[PDB]
Design a binder for this molecule. Structure first.
Ligand SMILES: *[C@@H]1O[C@H](CO)[C@@H](O)[C@H](O)[C@H]1NC(C)=O
Ligand code: NA
Lengths: 27, 250
């Protein structure tokens, strides 16, 4: 319903130390 | 996890731990997909060649943990299970095809800053992201190297390998309900899951909506972080139709 939105990251508007690596791979 | 590192506080809030009750030992990793449903791999519960056939009464589940040692009061929750649902066509006698399982908790878990469910992929999500080259994320408290257990939850970021590369790297019949991931010998990077990370989640962040989708379930592999060998994962989407029926029937 409100899944996959980490309360300490996505909700608080913060990136985890290595999530850019993932999004970067889509390019 | 092999060649992975320590997770951040509440980095994988859907991360679950499957325990045996007597004695209390780490079996597999798992994932929270709703208030009452957990999704691990079938081989964790049922593997007859190793006299493995677990009842609901045999197992325990721990959600919200960071340090496997340190018990944190109103952070981590320990739940027991009402019923277990292994795939009817789970092939243990040949290739670990349809290696999926569902666990209904005896009581729903309240969500927090540390307990939170993951998204299950859709038609479009799976077709667009389940493509070779893209990196996903494996997580678990399994062995740090092959035959060595970690304190804090481990995390590795692994790229999806081309289906023909997966096929030619093993002797086992790879089915559409499997996908593999890992770095190639000349990719200059390493990492894999190990004994204990089975049943665990392979996730991805949707560039479309910033939501974490669970693409796979840590299924099988030949060793841990072996050169020319890749990790095999249960193709969650290919079985979403089954996941739905068990959730909607119970
Ligand atoms: C597992 O055990 C239960 C009873 O404890 C039985 O109904 C089931 O058929 C068993 N399955 C296998 C493959 O051993
Ligand atoms: Na490898």
């Amino acid at each position: 319903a409100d899944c996959g939105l980490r309360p300490l990251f996505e909700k608080k508007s913060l990136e985890d130390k290595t999530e850019r690596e993932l999004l970067e791979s889509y390019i | 996890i092999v060649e992975g590192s320590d997770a951040e506080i509440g980095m994988s809030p859907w991360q679950v731990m499957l325990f045996r009750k007597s004695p209390q030992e780490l079996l597999c990793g798992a994932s929270l997909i709703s208030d009452r449903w957990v999704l691990t791999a079938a081989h964790c519960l049922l593997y007859p060649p190793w006299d493995k056939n677990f009842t609901e009464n045999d197992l325990l589940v721990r959600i919200g943990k960071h340090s496997r040692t340190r018990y944190e009061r109103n952070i981590e929750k320990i739940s027991m299970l009402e019923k277990i649902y292994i795939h009817p066509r789970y092939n243990w006698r040949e290739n670990l095809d349809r290696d999926i399982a569902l666990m209904k908790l005896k009581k729903p878990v309240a969500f927090s800053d540390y307990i939170h469910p993951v998204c299950l992929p859709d038609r479009e999500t799976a077709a667009s992201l389940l493509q070779a080259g893209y990196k996903g994320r494996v997580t678990g408290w399994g062995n740090l190297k092959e035959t060595g257990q970690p304190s804090v939850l481990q995390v590795v970021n692994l790229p999806i390998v081309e289906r023909p590369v997966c096929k030619d790297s093993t002797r086992i019949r790879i089915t559409d309900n499997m996908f593999c991931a890992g770095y190639k010998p000349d990719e200059g990077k390493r990492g894999d899951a190990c004994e204990g990370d089975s049943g665990g989640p392979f996730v991805m962040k949707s560039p479309f909506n910033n939501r974490w989708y669970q693409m796979g379930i840590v299924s099988w592999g030949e060793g841990c972080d072996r050169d020319g060998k890749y990790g095999f994962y249960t193709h969650v989407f290919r079985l979403k139709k089954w996941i739905q029926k068990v959730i909607d029937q119970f």
